[PDB]
Amino acid sequence: IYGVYLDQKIRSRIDGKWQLPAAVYGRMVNLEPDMTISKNEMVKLLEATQYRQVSKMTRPGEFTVQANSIEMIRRPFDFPDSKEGQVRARLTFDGDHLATIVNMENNRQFGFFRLDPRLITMISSQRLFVPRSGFPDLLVDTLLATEDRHTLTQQLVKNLFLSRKANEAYMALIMDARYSKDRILELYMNEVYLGQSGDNEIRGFPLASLYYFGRPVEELSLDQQALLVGMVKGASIYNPWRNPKLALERRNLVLRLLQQQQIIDQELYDMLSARPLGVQPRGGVISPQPAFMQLVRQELQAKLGDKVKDLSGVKIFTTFDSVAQDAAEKAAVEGIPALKKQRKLSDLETAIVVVDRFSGEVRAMVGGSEPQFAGYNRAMQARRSIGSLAKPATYLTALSQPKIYRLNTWIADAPIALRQVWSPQNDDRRYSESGRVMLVDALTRSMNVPTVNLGMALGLPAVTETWIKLGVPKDQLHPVPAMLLGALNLTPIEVAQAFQTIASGGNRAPLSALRSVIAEDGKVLYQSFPQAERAVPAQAAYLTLWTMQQVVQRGTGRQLGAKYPNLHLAGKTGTTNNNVDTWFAGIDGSTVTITWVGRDNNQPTKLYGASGAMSIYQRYLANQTPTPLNLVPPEDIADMGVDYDGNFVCSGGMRILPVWTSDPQSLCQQSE
Structure with a gap:
């Protein structure tokens, strides 16, 4: 009954079938x-x-x-x-x-x-069963030149059934005649053990092509097929990233082994033998870009529906920007260890989200200080308190009333006590000796008492209506005098949508990551169109976005205006009580970037908002070439000058401030 037993066991493992995977592009x-x-x-x-x-x-x-x-x-x-x-x-x-x-x-x-576009990853539900006709013609001939399977039957059973000299030897004798020699290798090349990553086993030529080179097996160069074939007797000995001098002398060895049965001449050998390891020089991943691909699968489930389970051969087109994502990860993995050692911190994390300024397409995302890990996405699940990053929505409601509130309105800076008894103190505990500060020196320096005196005069039923236009969910807004200073809990994907309505000029564009989904035959299953709905006036989102250029040049974020003074960044720095969280929302000519830096256990960090998420940001700018911010004034915005006492003058003045007015002769009335 031995012969009948093994046969039934063979068909058990062999069966389990296949389908094509879906490709996800940038x-x-x-x-x-x-x-x-x-x-x-x-x-x-x-x-x-x-x-x-x-x-x-x-x-x-x-x-x-x-x-x-x-x-x-x-x-x-x-x-x-x-x-x-x-x-x-x-x-x-x-x-x-x-x-x-x-x-x-x-x-x-x-x-x-x-x-x-670049291939981000392939998704099947890994199945990755390329048929016997989907492998290059020089691949089987390169596996046969180093593994003569005119030999291949025993090798199959060792990988398939084992990780017992009697079983596997008898297994190979009955597998040779029952199955054709073209059904044998189709199971071999799809099951060879070619490497190890963490605890997951890299098996097969399809899945090892993506892991080592990041491209489909049908596009392997003849010097990359020799590396992948030379690593059949490798498996964490002959692999790169550990010994990129031993995989290379094994690569050249397979070349001169496969040029014996002449398929490469001496001119082609010297050519291919000189090319370095074609492996992706970052460290291959089984599932690459895990932080971004959570936003896509969520977007695929909602935009398509019940068809998300039949994705076979379809091409998925996303808005992933690859140059900005390399600079986002290079700043998190190299910046967080530089913050931990200086303050002797035990742990510290981060999150970075980059969206397009005018359209809202997500270009990058980083879920933690190790963006190539998987399990926790702090850019979509970590709900932290924004803190001092919630003032641009208080002054955006004042400035949307241009009859009474301008950039030179005097705000009271006196000790105040309210009823939630609550008495806020300035972030530096200092008080202005004149007793008042203008509405531009309040946001530039991020003062705490004037923001409450301005926010309480507008009323919370109005500062809440601004937050809803910007695009925060109604359930997170709880109206109390602490909301004005940032008693608001928002994930970096909701702060990036809030500062995108200010950066574009009032046009709220819903953040998205799916561009289009094309089926395999050529049918278009989904094609995205812009929404770009109007939220706040274009003249009030310019006076706020102008003041946010002062909080970078001479305000609380002046340490950026001393390093990139040509870009004219706009950005609000976010701080909290005892520095539980620190943010920095910065805007340049093309994108809005949101940075967060805090400890997952909610304890203080010793980092100040100008040294936490702000130092991670001025690395993200250095790893690429940003585009300068050039604010074009909308209609009805007219520059007017003020004198010492904060009054409008006809000519001269010691300071120039834009003013939303359709008759710039307001100074004629205020000079007299």
Whole structure:
């Protein structure tokens, strides 16, 4: 009964079938002649779209770099607009911009050169069962040149059934005749043990192609197939990131082993033997971008519905920006250890969210001080208290009443006591000796007593109505005199949507991460359109966004205006009582960034809002090239000058402040 027993056990493991996976792409870049991008700014964009920089390109996906230009072979892609193939373009640069996109094939010109998006990850529900015809032709021939399976039957049983010399040996004898030799290797190449990551087993050539190179197995270069085949006798000995000198002498060994049965000449060998390890030089992950992909799967469940379970072969198009995500992670993993050691802190975390200024598309996300971990997303689940970051919504309600509240209205700065008895004290405990401060020196310096004296005069039923227009949920707003100073609990994904209505000029655009979902045959299952609803007046969201340029240049965030004085950042620094949380919401010409820095156990941190999330931010700016903030004044905004006593004057004045007025002759009445 031995023969009958083993046969039934074989079919048990062999069965379990397959389907295709769904691919998740990033955003699409469109290169254009005379566009603001440098050569070193262009190599960091291609290297983030998974473009191997080689010294002699021969296969789609490789780009070389030259004197003052960049040659490249754009890999084929099926764009939602049209279907395109290879393109050999030579991007000639002109210093700080892009001159020409001459097509190398016939020295033609290009109107605008489209770039294929990057593959974030593949999702199946890993199934990843590429059939016997989905593997390259030089892959089986490279596995046979180093594993003659004209030998392959025993190797299958060792990986499949084992992690018993009698069982597996008898297993191989009955598997050889019962199954065809083309059904054998199809099960082998999809089950080989090729590496170990943490506690998860990297099995198969499909799943090991994405793990090591981040690209489908049908696109492996012949020097990358030799590395992946040379690591069948590897498994945490011959793998890179540990011994990237031993995987290399095994890579070259398989090449000269597979050039014996001639399929590579000496010119091709010296070419391939010189290319370094093509592995993604960051550390492969089984499930990459876990913080962002939580926002996508949530967006897929809501926007599609019950069809989210039948995603087979569909291409998913997101708004993920890869250059901004590399700079967001590079600042969290390298900034948090620099804050912990200086204050002798035991733990410390972070979260960073980047959205587009005018459209609300999410470009980056970081869930913690180790963004490549999984299990807790602090940018979507950590509900912290915003603190001093809730003043821009008090002054945005004052400034939306231009008949009575301007940038020079005098606010009282006297000791106050209310009934929640409550008596706020300034964040530095100092009081103005004149007894009053203007409405611009109150937000620039982030004063606590004037903000209450201004917030109590408007009434909380009005400061609450502003918070709802900005896009916070009605259930988080509990109206008490402490809300004015930031007794508000919001996740970094709700603070980024609040400061996006101020940054765009009042146009509330709902944050999104799905661009479009195209089925496998060409049918469009979902196509996103902008909403961009109007919330606050464009003249009140400019006077607030102007004052937020003073809180960066000479205000509480002046330490940024001394480092990037050309960008003209706008940003509010957030502090709390005893520094439980510290934020920094900063705005530049293109994106809104929200940073949080605090301890998960809710204890004090010793970090001040100008040294916590603000120091993580001035790293995020250094890891890329930001766009300057240029505020264009809307209609009816007219600059007027004030004298010493804070009155409008006809000409001169010791200070110039914008004023929302349709008849700038208000100074004629206030001069007299």
